[PDB]
Structures are given as structure tokens and as C-alpha cells.
Amino acid sequence: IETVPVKLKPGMDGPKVKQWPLTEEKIKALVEICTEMEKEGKISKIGPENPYNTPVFAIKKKDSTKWRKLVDFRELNKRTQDFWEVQLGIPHPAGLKKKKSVTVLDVGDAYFSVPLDEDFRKYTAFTIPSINNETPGIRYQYNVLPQGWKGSPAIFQSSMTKILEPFKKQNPDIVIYQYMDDLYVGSDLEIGQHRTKIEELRQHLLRWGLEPPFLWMGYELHPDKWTVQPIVLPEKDSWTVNDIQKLVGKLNWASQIYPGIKVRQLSKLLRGTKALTEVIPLTEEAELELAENREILKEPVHGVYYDPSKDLIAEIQKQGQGQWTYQIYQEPFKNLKTGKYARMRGAHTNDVKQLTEAVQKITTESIVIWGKTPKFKLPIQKETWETWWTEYWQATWIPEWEFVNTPPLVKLWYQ
Amino acid sequence: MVPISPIETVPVKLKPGMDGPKVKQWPLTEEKIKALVEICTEMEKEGKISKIGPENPYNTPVFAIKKKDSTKWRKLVDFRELNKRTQDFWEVQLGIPHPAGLKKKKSVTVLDVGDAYFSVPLDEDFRKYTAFTIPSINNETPGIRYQYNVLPQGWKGSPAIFQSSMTKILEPFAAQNPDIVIYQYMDDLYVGSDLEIGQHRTKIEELRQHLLRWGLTTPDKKHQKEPPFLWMGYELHPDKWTVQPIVLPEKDSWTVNDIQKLVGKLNWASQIYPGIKVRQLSKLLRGTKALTEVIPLTEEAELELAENREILKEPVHGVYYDPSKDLIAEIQKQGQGQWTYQIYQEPFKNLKTGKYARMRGAHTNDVKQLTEAVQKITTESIVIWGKTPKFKLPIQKETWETWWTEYWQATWIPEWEFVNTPPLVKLWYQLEKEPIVGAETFYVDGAANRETKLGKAGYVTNKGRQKVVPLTNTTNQKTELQAIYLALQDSGLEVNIVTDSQYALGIIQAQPDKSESELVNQIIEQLIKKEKVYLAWVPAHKGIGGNEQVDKLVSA
Ligand SMILES: Cc1cc(/C=C/C#N)cc(C)c1Nc1ccnc(Nc2ccc(C#N)cc2)n1
Ligand SMILES: CNc1ccc(C(F)(F)F)cc1N
Ligand SMILES: [Mg+2]
């Protein structure tokens, strides 16, 4: 009810980010949403003395008919002071990634019950544009904690811990983790029991709330089953020259990750200038070297550790036929997680929708495992991505990304 | 008298850490002083400025400028210094409407709101910073000191605060009259509708009544300005629009500056005149910036110009937007990285046109450029109409499918249909996914000496075919490409090629059909003539036969 003082980082002005073009459908949805938010006192109209801006758009959550406003606070989040006042860190729960079910709840509507520091509100300014700029954009700022701002879970944390005390005491084996607008609730129970406990948890927030438009939803994960991608080599009875060349290439790449990898004996098989499709018998010095490499590749990579002070980096490769491979790391060749997708939802003829859904799944895994989002290296032209990703976004957070313009040769090795 | 609603003032601040201006007043002739005193006395009577005491330490210089061909002086308060120190504001006019997004209107009336401007008060706490001084006659008395009570012309915040104040006044009238559109430009309001003139004239009088709630008067002798409107370089008519006349000059010789102005005119024209081209004319300004330097026009640029003169021979107009109908965008390839497009709803009635130019880059191909043009038109269309047009594109559906399923990047173009109008965009070559049985295998390599720039490129094959070529003034990268070229030149229609060049694979896996490198262009020319090409990569210096042999031959 009383505002926590909030400041930007020293020598840092507010965000002045351009509003990108919005479709008629999204504008109409935002006008209706913001008209109601204004009546409810969550936002207020602002004047021209406020030069700041943060982009806004609208999404449709996974399995929903109703538009949700999404503010892209990435710039404001970078410029907002860090929050270690009341605490010296909220250690990420390492057990969340080990539960048989994790449900993700949109609890952002709760933030709207806490007022925002009067001196900070100006920095949350945003604009609803008009088609063809025919009327002045509608300008508003927040009077309460906004969804998507990094300070909102921080300021609301005290309130959240007390709302959840009865449920935690009564269910002590449940892991509850909050990231931005999401609540992650992991358990080891039968999914039928799980869904009940989840609905139990909703009632605590509806009870305290006295309505949340998207609190009833549930994104169901199962991190216990998340797969990885170790380096595997082919098992063949007939090796062509081309097969052996591909094998020596892959092993040369792997030797940057695993020290003891050797190719000397396999290269020797390709002694001469042979047709690519000619079959080469493995001599046994080569079969041994290959078995030795196979055994090396069954062990973990050496010297791989997570440093919470360093960015996570996520790389993605398009493998074709709806399949995507990815790696998360902080140092080159020290992968913290690798993976592969194929089941990309309703996008069999749309590369960019598939990539956007892969980005969201990888970010979700990263939040669960380390409690922060990775910086993506995306195999797409900037202009193609920027034109379309907002059409397929269903998450309430947004990661950072850069673009890969040169084809990586390593795509072949993750296939 | 009738109470009027006050216009809420906008709170204004100087930038952090800054103080108001303290600028010395220039000496003025006795004649100018007398004119400024008379001018300011009138302004003071009208409430625009007020005399201040000597406490105020701020100052901005004032000048007297003779209105040409007249004995009437006019005052200029030079706020350049206060503007440097005044906060930034939200500027709404950054994006101006494009005529092609406007809707056809039966009537459009103009209303002068120049008097309302000086009804917007200036924030009381900011007025002190606007102080200025009329010098005294012979400098024998204190100068007369004034400050502003209203938005000063020339002050940084006046456009934004005036626009925002008028918008707030107009909002309830627009919201409760959804059968009209209101627009603010300079000191005029433009009001359009589809109503019969009678009802339209009523709305206008109701708008005047609404404005009088704030004491804002509008001249009853209605505005002289009437359709067509000259606005932001366009001509607006009730049911069509165009650009203001585009006249390309006749010239015996052209300077850098003339070519810059010519291209600017062609660019402006290209939004409704289809097919405008500026590539060859723009090439002439490459790198140079000798504004007065003359450049001979290439034969290519003379043809481009002549082609443009013909396009501009007679007037062309666009129609306005009908939201009840689909938007269609059609694109044509023009050559040399140039693309042109038309957006329409009914056949042969364009809303607008435009062009797109290939981005600067080492290697490119038509499919990538078409894709980029589509994204540009998509984004422009969202801005102007709030939705994506349906596309008509010169590429077969099967060509697109082959492209995007095999391209290493994610890529997408929205709903589109093939339009069979040459030049068609096509795939010029596709590499094999598997080694070719029965095709000769060429192991290629090249190397160069970093200091002498001498090198070698060559190949050895499984049939014992071999070639090594000595090269001068070359690099490791060039020799690696030269080796692949030699293998293409000397092989049959089907060929397997083995290289260790990550550089060459990076280029070829990008699937260019045109390059700045003449060597890449030669490789492309050879690829186009083949039936099947499999390109295989191996790591260098690993004892891989064939590769090892030719590496020795070329590194010698
Ligand atoms: C942007 C704009 C500039 C001017 C005027 C600018 C100036 N000078 C006048 C108006 C009314 C508007 N606003 C809108 C909004 C929607 N449709 C239209 N259509 C429209 C506008 C003018 C004419 C005409 N003649 C015909 C149709 N105008
Ligand atoms: C920036 N000018 C402006 C202000 C207010 C309106 C309104 F009619 F929507 F109220 C239209 C315009 N063009
Ligand atoms: Mg070599």
C-alpha cells in the first residue's frame, strides 16, 4: 500500500524506445484493455512533458481466446537499479528441475494491487499507436507495479511470501519458484493430484485478491523427462570414403570438446585419391581408435561449471523437417545443456513460427534450470525475425537475441 | 460574461543540472527599439507577456527584423539558448499519415485556430526562464524587462504542448462524433466527413461551439484553403491523391549536388509513379562528397534518367483506402538489385507504389532479395493500413518450397500467389545431398605465400586427372576458390568436389547467384551448367588422402 522507493542506475535516463507497427486487431485490443485499466486506476494518461517510451503489443496465451497486453520492458529492466535491499540474493532452487511435473502460473495480475513509486511512474510510459498515425498515439503510464518489469516481483516478493505461507506449510515438498510474471510449481505427484494442488494454489490468490484474467490457465512441464544430446558416432558395416570423411570431420570437431580424441588411424584408411562412394574396409587399428573415441564420448565434458555472473548463450540450428537442435553455454565448447525439438506446434509450413516456439521452450528450460534467460544466436535475417516473431509469441517475458548471418559448418555435427 | 474552461498547463523543467539562459542583449538602433516597444506594448495588452522587476537574472536576446517590402518591423525573440537547456518532450508529429492510408471524404473543411495558440498558458514556474529585455533609448534608463505567459513561438516545447492541449480539447468531440475525422496541422484544423453538406456544416458549427467552451474563437469568414490541399509534398483531393509536380531539370552537365537532388525527387516520385529506378544514378555518388564536383553521366545513368523522364511524362494519382476490401501487393524484379511494387485493392487502381534496393553485401541472390522486399512492404503496410497485403510474386510455388525447406536459415513470406510475369525468380543451382555414384571425385586445394602473394591452385581426382596452376598477386582465400573453379571447369556434368576450405563452404552454403567477387561469379557460372554437384568438406592437415596429396602440390 506504501511505495518502495525505486531508482534507475546511476548516470542513466529513462527508456526512449520506438513503438513498432501494430496491426489493427492488436490496436483495437489494446484500446479496450487500456480503457478498462484506466478506469481501474492501474494506468493514467500522461502529457508531453514525459518523453519516455517502452513498446507495447498484444499476445494470446497458450490455449486462450483473450488478448493479453505485453509490454516490452527489456530496456527499462536493464536501466532499473538492482534489488538487493531486503535480502542478499534469492538462491535459485536447484530442485525445481528435478520434479515430475512443473506447472507455470501467470500471476502477474497480483502486481496491480501494489502502487508504484510516484517518482518512478514516468519511466513506464507507453503509447498505443493509431493506424497511419491519423490520430495522436494514446499515452499512458503505470500507477501500479507493471507486468513484465523486473522490479515488480522484487517489490511484491514480501506480499507473495505471506500469501503462500499456508500452502507451503501444508505442502512442504512442493517447490514454488517465481520468475517475472510466472509462478513455477513443481511436485512429484500423480498429475491428477498435481492439477488439484495447482487449483488449490489458485484459490489462495483468488482469496487474497478479495478478477485475474489468466490465472486459471496452466502450462504443464515435465523436466524429469527433458532429453540431452550426447555426441554419437555412426555404427556401420560398410563405410564409404565419404562416410569416413564425415566421421573424421565430426571427430575433429569433437576433439575441441574432448581432449583425447584421435583420428590418425581413421585418416590412414583414406590413403590415396579414392572415389567418394567407394567402400573402405576398416582395418583394426582404425576400429580400435574408433572404439576408443566412442568410449571418450560417453563421459561428461571436463571443466564445465555454471557462473551466475556470466550470460547464458543459446545457439539454435535448423535441421529440416521440423527438427531443431540447440546448445546452451557460457564458454565455447563447454555446453551446460543441449537438446533437440521436432514436435513444433502447428507450424509445419512456417519456419519462423517454429523458431519462435523453440526460443520460448529454450527460455523456459533456462528459467527452470538457472533462473534467468539466455541471449540467443538466431539463424535468421534480422528483418524477417523482427517482422514476424510478435505474431507467434505466447510468453509474458522476452529474451535478448542476435542474428547469425553466416552458415555454421557445425550444424552437420548436431544432426 | 460566459465562464470558459481554463487550459491545463503542462509542467516544464530544464534539463537536470542546467540553469536558465543568461544571454547578453544586442544593442539596437533607436528605430528598432521604438518598434519593439510598440509591439511588446500590444502583446502585453493581450496578456501574452508581462513586465518583470529586476530580480529575475535570466535573459534571451530580442531582435527587430524588417518585413521585406514594408515599413513594418517584426520582433524575433531568439530562444536558441533556452532550447538547449529545456527538457525533451514527447513529439507526436514524428509519424505523419501517408495519403494512401487515408479514407475518401465527401467534404473537408479547414478552421483557423491561430488564436487558440496564445490561449495555452505557459507553466507559471517556467516563465522566468523566458525573460528578455528591450534596450533603452541611448541606454540611459533600465531596459524594459518582459517574460512570457503563453507558449513562445520558437521555444522548444511550444509545438508539443500546443498539439497536446488541442488534442485534449478535441478528444471528446471526436469520440462522440465518430462520423467525422479531425486533423491538426500548424494553426489549422481539418475536418472531413461523408455527410451530406448540410449535416457536415452542422458538425462544423457544433465544433465551433465546443471550442468556445475554452474561449477559442475561429474566424467566421471561412477558410480560403479548399481542396486540393498542398501538404507535406503531396496534393490531397477528396477522392484521390498524388505527389506535387515532379519536374526533372534539363542539364548539359551534372554536379554531385544536382544528382543528389535528382535522386531525392525520383525517390519522392516512386511512391505513386510505378517503375522509377535510381540505381545507376545513385552509383555516381559512391563515396564522393564534393558537392560542386561534376560527374560524367554513364551511358547506364543516361538510360535510367531517360526511362524516368518517360514515366514522369504525365500525372498519376493514387486512390484512397477502402477498409472493406483486401489489400494486394505485387512485386517485379527490375535488375541490378532493384525491385518495384504496387499496392492496390481494385485492379488497375493503385493506392501507392514503391521500390526496394538490394542491401550492400558481398554475395546475394534473388530469392533473398525478394524475401527482404516482402518484409519491407509488410512493415510499411502495417504502418499505413494496420494489416499485411496478399502478395502476388514472380516466383513459382515449387521454387519457394524448394528454397525454404533446404535453406540453412529460418525464413517465411506471408500468404502469396504466383504471378507469371517475367523476369521470374528461380533457383540457378542446387547442390546434392549425397555423393554421386559414378561421378569423378575432385580433391581440390590452394595456398599462397603471404609475403610474395604467389600461390597455387589445383586438384587431383580418382581417375588420375590432375592440374596445378601457378598464381600471382593472390591470397589463401582466393586460391581456395580458384581450385574449386578449376574442378568445375574440368569435370563432366556430374562431379564430386572435396575441399578443406571453410571459407569457400561458407560462401557456397549461402547459395549466392551474384557476387562482388568475379571469382565467385565464375564459380556460379560453372555451377549453373552442371547437372549434379556434391560439395564435401574435410578438415585440413589430417592425412585425408586426395586432400593431402593436392595440399602438397599447391603448398610447394
Ligand atoms: C491526415 C489528414 C490531413 C488533412 C489535410 C492536410 C492539409 N493540408 C486532412 C485530414 C482530414 C486528415 N485526416 C484524415 C483521416 C482519414 N482520412 C482522411 N482522408 C482525406 C483527407 C483529405 C482529403 C482531401 N482533399 C480527402 C480525404 N483524412
Ligand atoms: C495531433 N492532432 C490531433 C489531436 C486530436 C485528435 C482527435 F480528433 F482524435 F481528438 C486528432 C488529431 N489529429
Ligand atoms: Mg591446404
Swiss-Prot record, chain A:
Phenotype when changing M180V: 58% loss of polymerase activity. No loss of RNase H activity
Domain Reverse transcriptase: 40-221
Domain of life: Viruses
Outcome following mutation: M180L: 90% loss of polymerase activity. No loss of RNase H activity
Result after altering W385L: No effect on RT p66/p51 heterodimerization
Outcome after substituting L215A: No effect on RNA-dependent DNA polymerase activity. No effect on RNA 5'-end and 3'-end cleavages
Reported impact of W216A: Complete loss of RNA-dependent DNA polymerase activity. No effect on RNA 5'-end and 3'-end cleavages
Effect of W149A: 73% loss of DNA-directed DNA polymerase activity. 70% loss of RNA-directed DNA polymerase activity
Listed result of changing W388L: Almost complete loss of RT p66/p51 heterodimerization. Complete loss of polymerase activity
Reported impact of L70V: No loss of polymerase activity. No loss of RNase H activity
Phenotypic consequence of L183V: 22% loss of DNA-directed DNA polymerase activity. No loss of RNA-directed DNA polymerase activity
Outcome reported for the amino acid change (mutating P51G): 64% loss of polymerase activity. 57% loss of RNase H activity
Motif (Tryptophan repeat motif): 385-401
Effect on the protein upon substituting L290S: 59% loss of polymerase activity. 8% loss of RNase H activity
Protein name, entry field: p51 RT
Full-protein positions shown: 604 to 1027 of 1447
